[PDB]
Amino acid sequence: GKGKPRGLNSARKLRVHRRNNRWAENNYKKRLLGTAFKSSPFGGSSHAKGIVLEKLGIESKQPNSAIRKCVRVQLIKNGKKVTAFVPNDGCLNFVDENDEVLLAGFGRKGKAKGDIPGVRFKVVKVSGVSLLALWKEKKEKPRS
Amino acid sequence: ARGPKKHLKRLAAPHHWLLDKLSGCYAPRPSAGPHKLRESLPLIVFLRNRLKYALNGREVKAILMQRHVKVDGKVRTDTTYPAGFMDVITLDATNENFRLVYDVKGRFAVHRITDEEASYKLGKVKKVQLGKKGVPYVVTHDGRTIRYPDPNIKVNDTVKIDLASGKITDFIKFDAGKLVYVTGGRNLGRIGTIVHKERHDGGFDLVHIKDSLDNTFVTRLNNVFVIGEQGKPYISLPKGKGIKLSIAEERDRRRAQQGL
Amino acid sequence: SVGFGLVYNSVAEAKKFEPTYRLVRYGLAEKVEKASRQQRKQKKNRDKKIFGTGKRLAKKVARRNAD
Amino acid sequence: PRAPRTYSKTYSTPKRPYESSRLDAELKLAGEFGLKNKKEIYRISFQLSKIRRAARDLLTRDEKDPKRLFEGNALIRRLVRVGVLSEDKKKLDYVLALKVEDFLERRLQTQVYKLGLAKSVHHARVLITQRHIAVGKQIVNIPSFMVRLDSEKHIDFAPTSPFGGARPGRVARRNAARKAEASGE
Amino acid sequence: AKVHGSLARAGKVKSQTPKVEKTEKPKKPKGRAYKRLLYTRRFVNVTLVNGKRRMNPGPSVQ
RNA sequence: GGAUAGUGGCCUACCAUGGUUUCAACGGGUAACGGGGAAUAAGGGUUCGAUUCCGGAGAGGGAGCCUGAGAAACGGCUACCACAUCCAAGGAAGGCAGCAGGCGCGCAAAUUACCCAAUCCUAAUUCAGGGAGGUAGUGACAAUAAAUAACGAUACAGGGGUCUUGUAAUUGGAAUGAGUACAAUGUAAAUACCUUAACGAGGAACAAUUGGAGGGCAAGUCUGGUGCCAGCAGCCGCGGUAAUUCCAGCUCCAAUAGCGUAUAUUAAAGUUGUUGCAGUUAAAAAGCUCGUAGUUGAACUUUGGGCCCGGUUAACGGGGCCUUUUUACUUUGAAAAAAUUAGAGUGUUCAAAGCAGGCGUAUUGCUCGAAUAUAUUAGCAUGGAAUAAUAGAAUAGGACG
Ligand SMILES: NC[C@@H]1O[C@H](O[C@H]2[C@@H](O)[C@H](O[C@@H]3[C@@H](O)[C@H](N)C[C@H](N)[C@H]3O[C@H]3O[C@H](CO)[C@@H](O)[C@H](O)[C@H]3N)O[C@@H]2CO)[C@H](N)[C@@H](O)[C@@H]1O
Ligand SMILES: NC[C@@H]1O[C@H](O[C@H]2[C@@H](O)[C@H](O[C@@H]3[C@@H](O)[C@H](N)C[C@H](N)[C@H]3O[C@H]3O[C@H](CO)[C@@H](O)[C@H](O)[C@H]3N)O[C@@H]2CO)[C@H](N)[C@@H](O)[C@@H]1O
Ligand SMILES: [Mg+2]
Ligand SMILES: [Mg+2]
Ligand SMILES: [Mg+2]
Ligand SMILES: [Mg+2]
Ligand SMILES: [Mg+2]
Ligand SMILES: [Mg+2]
Ligand SMILES: [Mg+2]
Ligand SMILES: [Mg+2]
Ligand SMILES: [Mg+2]
């Protein structure tokens, strides 16, 4: 029983068979395949600067109804086009076409969050100030 | 890496210098000596860090360049000069002398010997061979080569050595129950006598030891230095006389003489 | 307070063994005048470019009429 | 390539942050000691845990073990010397029972209140951090100063300030000088 | 999902709510002195009971 | 044989056909310099290490070389390729992964400062030189310490005549550094720290913040705004007219000179399972049998008896007698860098640290320190002979004198 070798000489059959089944673990897979460095819009980094293409309102999922006010962004280091959500209230007015905004994840391990389908990123800064200091009125966005 | 390395980094220095972590990135890097800079005392360490006579780097030179210090009978100009085991270090204007001998923790101890006993030194004969013309020769731990020696002397003896001249005043052979100072190792700095020498063909003979308090322990033959006849060294050992008192035993003796 | 002090066996022996930055604030010596390290450094780099007295050189300058 | 100057963090923060009860017990300890932030409660429970864990793996060693001898008795002797472990509770078993209020009790703040000199823990601190509670000759303004057992009797007001010695404060010495032109010329 | 909706109303609720000023009020103690007031109001005082030890009720029921 | 400083297919000549591999060669990837170490803190582990120390490699890419004890050197030369500077058009010069500093890159990182005083190195050498190094600027990386108030008075509520807290914004004198600054102190010279004249406290200033208040999860059935809109919401969910959830006011919780967010990683995770998973039906026993590798494989060979010597709190431990007398493993040790981890000691005012210090007669002084233990693989020496392997006389080519 136990289905696995306990023999005193069996170290390699053990050491291997685990190294084999570790591949079933999602977190381990991603590390070996280099998933982030390849398949991710960010390089595997925590943030990306990009530039806004078009302001995008997005319908929500069930059972919710509202327009979510996102943007299309083209990452500078990358060129990969990505859609990011603009949070709080009426901050879409703070970003415009071709505004050069800084992005971050949603904290979801790459998944999309909440009633917003297919948006994995959020705006952090605009023009290099912040979403707070604008929405909280503390600072103000400069001119181009 | 392209040649000789002219620097030493602090934290890379020998531990038995007892340098402090901060105060610089570098140690003195002892000069090319009679002794291996691994196990050796640069003059600056002795004068400045032990005798506390010199406060500076520039100050140690002002002493030597004032012609003050000698070592093993001869004046030593070199700041980093590597005074090793069984050395002399006479300072006339201070009237003192010091024979370098190890602690029971294993560091070079600051040990004053009188205007005599700084006459002679002991050294361990590392090899004895035939030189040119047939002339036999012998050389000590510190690289003294002495010519036309006693046919009894073999490797792993010691030799009593006059300084102002040289040569050989008697000697001590290596056999059961001789006095021995431990040159380096886990047991470095200890003193004892020979319980047995475990022979090993092709390197690393074990030497069994017993001290004045009847403790047993072993080290390498290469680190076994004969210091004389059992219970009677040929030089003056410091306090504890290399007895290796246990850490527990230490605490008492510190809180013993500590009171009123 | 805590500090250090030295009692010398001559004044001429403190005229010798003593670090010279004290000898100014002690009055026994004079603060030396030198341009800042780089200005001191640069002039040395300028001069090694000339191999000689530098005398025949600056004349050959005026041999061809200045620079 | 400077020698690598070392350091450490003095506290360990709790796993489950929001526990409804523990929050209260800490708040009390903040008041019934007179502590600034919850970190000064954390600092001690971390100290205690390493103290405990030290004794934890020490009692695992069958007795007459030099490690249980030399080290275990080097703890007690330090632990009593500050007044935490009572003059004799001394054992490796009685440090494991030693709780968090015992260290906190020995703080210079929680002493300066204890015998005279303060009559508040908030007056205590304010006194400590401002100059004069000094122990012996040296002023020590640290509210955490950790009074040792026999250092106790040497703690009184400091050789300076209105409480222990020369001159009064310049709050009042300014009051006496503003009647100098009022009641004088 | 369906990616083109109205952008017309954004900052709507926020900008149609009336501004309310924050009252000028006594500055609260900092440091240990704030942690002093918390000691009392939770116990040594016993503002509220029924075993709830209510920290912040709407001004009770009656 | 030649070549080297020298061994060696290092190269050449002749000769043979060898050498490695499922115990994983060879090949590919590495967002790979190796190590000391770091994060995590039942145990067993998982993850990381460009980076203070050691070793290695390189100086745009390659190769070649001169000098030399030492270089296949680059702040040396020669060539090529790729850059790139001056030019009078003939020519000439260059290598910041040294210190600064510029452009570029991006989420991502500081002054074209001072100095040889310290640590040290170099030289013909106490003197000179050192962007090694040190100082200072920038510096919320990280770590330590831990101000933002303290005590009465009076006026009402309240606990056995009267304390002792709760509340007034009605007063009362107290205190202190944050600043500010003679000085001296520090220092190479300043800078700041420490010590200190004169100055420095009434709420408005010497005004703490960041997140959150349905559950998880600690704190609003309060008011106003909005009306499945604007928005919140890690997840469950909130909002479609009386919103515990959005925007705010009020209050309240939480941690607090710091709190939040993104990303990675660890714990939780016995959801990688050696410890320690699960597999009839939730994910999952090959259709069936053979079988190489691999892993695994019954028992039996000195058992028992009798005395002795010296050990440590009759239980037990160690060393010898008598009775017909090759490994794997396990202990002890040696040889193990310093940092780092653990840890002894010590009043840096506490502490993080540091490895100093401590007593004195303080008028030519005494003096204890700088302990201790650690990755358990390999190697070396050693005691142990259970366990599991291995050899031994079968056509005797056996042992013995
Ligand atoms: N500015 C830093 C660097 O300077 C370099 O330029 C320098 C080099 O081209 C050349 O430097 C030579 C060097 O080639 C040679 N192999 C060594 C020599 N010592 C250097 O010489 C230099 O230093 C001496 C003082 O020693 C000074 O007279 C002068 O600054 C210069 N001739 O002289 C230039 C300075 O005058 C390059 N432009 C570049 O790598 C970088 O800009
Ligand atoms: N720091 C001093 C010591 O250095 C040691 O360094 C190691 C190596 O330097 C040394 O390696 C060997 C040595 O085994 C042997 N008996 C002598 C030999 N010359 C050394 O090797 C030397 O030459 C080789 C080949 O050129 C180089 O690759 C190597 O870097 C160099 N050290 O052996 C040491 C132990 O393996 C250790 N790090 C340590 O004991 C200690 O730190
Ligand atoms: Mg859903
Ligand atoms: Mg999309
Ligand atoms: Mg900008
Ligand atoms: Mg931006
Ligand atoms: Mg940015
Ligand atoms: Mg040197
Ligand atoms: Mg070596
Ligand atoms: Mg040959
Ligand atoms: Mg050869």
Ligand SMILES: [Mg+2]
């Ligand atoms: Mg072939």
Ligand SMILES: [Mg+2]
């Ligand atoms: Mg690489």
Ligand SMILES: [Mg+2]
């Ligand atoms: Mg790595």
Ligand SMILES: [Mg+2]
């Ligand atoms: Mg590395």
Ligand SMILES: [Mg+2]
């Ligand atoms: Mg851990």
Ligand SMILES: [Mg+2]
């Ligand atoms: Mg663990």
Ligand SMILES: [Mg+2]
């Ligand atoms: Mg676990």
Ligand SMILES: [Mg+2]
């Ligand atoms: Mg890299």
Ligand SMILES: [Mg+2]
């Ligand atoms: Mg890396």
Ligand SMILES: [Mg+2]
């Ligand atoms: Mg290196």
Ligand SMILES: [Mg+2]
């Ligand atoms: Mg380059």
Ligand SMILES: [Mg+2]
């Ligand atoms: Mg020559």
Ligand SMILES: [Mg+2]
């Ligand atoms: Mg090189």
Ligand SMILES: [Mg+2]
């Ligand atoms: Mg070079």
Ligand SMILES: [Mg+2]
């Ligand atoms: Mg080169």
Ligand SMILES: [Mg+2]
């Ligand atoms: Mg260069």
